[PDB]
Design a protein around this ligand. Structure first.
Ligand SMILES: NCC[C@H](O)C(=O)N[C@@H]1C[C@H](N)[C@@H](O[C@H]2O[C@H](CN)[C@@H](O)[C@H](O)[C@H]2N)[C@H](O[C@@H]2O[C@H](CO)[C@H](O)[C@H]2O)[C@H]1O
Ligand SMILES: Nc1ncnc2c1ncn2[C@@H]1O[C@H](COP(=O)(O)OP(=O)(O)NP(=O)(O)O)[C@@H](O)[C@H]1O
Ligand SMILES: [Mg+2]
Ligand SMILES: [Mg+2]
Length: 263
């Protein structure tokens, strides 16, 4: 009752015209705040998601920690208000990657960008990284989500051709076939709509609730998935690995792609 945002947060944003973001299918609410001289974004998750990699508070922590390490929005305000975790942030710098480069026209550039994300991430010191997204941690949260009907279990997972017939069957695979983990900085949802570019370089990362320490193959796997889905031609997957300077590990790649299935 009353409000989802505090009186002080409301005071902060009242001069702005709120526009609800439509493209975005997580449990968070995202609002673009249009002001006279700049836009802000306000992102909110409810208490059901506290402690999970959807938790906007966890995203806020990573956003703060990443300042000076990766280009990310500025955290302007955070609060917990009546169950809700609310994050007010600045607008990322540059153009959303999915908007700047289309798959039909700039395949090599897209591959190049993804590759540069991986390289950049590997240079980040994770000594004092706030969160460790080990598989034990991710699996524990997936178990929590499934138990409480909070996972993304619907739609494509009902199709008769699905590799696993129900969520617990997938969960079992993930739980019992964990690969070896060598921890590095991981974005957690590396994709063309969580990344900004400017002057042909990466200029911002957003959607950071799932970022933290994780195995190096995790983000690489997301790149492979994107390349195959958006571009399709396998040549470009091979090119991606040519830029990385490593041979693929299809077992680990398949694993992390399956891990993200229910998120
Ligand atoms: N042949 C592949 C099918 C397989 O079921 C699978 O990989 N399925 C995956 C499941 C994955 N969780 C989806 O993620 C997407 O949904 C999440 C929320 N439920 C978002 O938080 C996330 O950022 C977004 N990437 C992904 O969607 C892909 O990302 C695109 C959107 O950004 C597009 O929607 C789709 O390509 C989809 O292909
Ligand atoms: N700080 C920002 N600067 C500029 N654009 C933003 C910013 N935050 C969010 N957006 C836009 O809003 C969209 C969704 O924000 P995002 O943080 O990715 O949502 P989400 O709740 O995590 N949903 P999903 O991307 O499906 O997981 C982005 O793709 C951008 O288009
Ligand atoms: Mg996103
Ligand atoms: Mg997200």
């Amino acid at each position: 009752a009353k409000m989802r945002i505090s009186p002080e947060l409301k005071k902060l944003i009242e001069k702005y015209r709120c526009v609800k973001d439509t493209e975005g299918m997580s449990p968070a609410k995202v609002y673009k705040l249009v002001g006279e001289n700049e836009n802000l974004y306000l992102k909110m998750t409810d208490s059901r998601y506290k402690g999970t990699t959807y938790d906007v508070e966890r995203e806020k922590d990573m956003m703060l920690w990443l300042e000076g390490k990766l280009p990310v929005p500025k955290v302007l305000h955070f609060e917990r208000h009546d169950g809700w975790s609310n994050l007010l942030m600045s607008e990322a710098d540059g153009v959303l990657c999915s908007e700047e480069y289309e798959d039909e026209q700039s395949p090599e550039k897209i591959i190049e960008l993804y590759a540069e994300c991986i390289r950049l991430f590997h240079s980040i010191d994770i000594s004092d990284c706030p969160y460790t997204n080990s598989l034990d941690s991710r699996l524990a949260e997936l178990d929590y989500l499934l138990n409480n009907d909070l996972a993304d279990v619907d739609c494509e997972n009902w199709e008769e051709d699905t590799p696993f017939k129900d969520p617990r069957e997938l969960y079992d695979f993930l739980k019992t076939e964990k690969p070896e983990e060598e921890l590095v900085f991981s974005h957690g949802d590396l994709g063309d709509s969580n990344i900004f570019v400017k002057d042909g370089k990466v200029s911002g990362f957003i959607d950071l609730g799932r970022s933290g320490r994780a195995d190096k193959w995790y983000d690489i796997a997301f790149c492979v998935r994107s390349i195959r889905e958006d571009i399709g031609e396998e040549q470009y997957v091979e090119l991606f690995f040519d830029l990385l300077g490593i041979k693929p590990d299809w077992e680990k790649i398949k694993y992390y792609i399956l891990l993200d299935e229910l998120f």
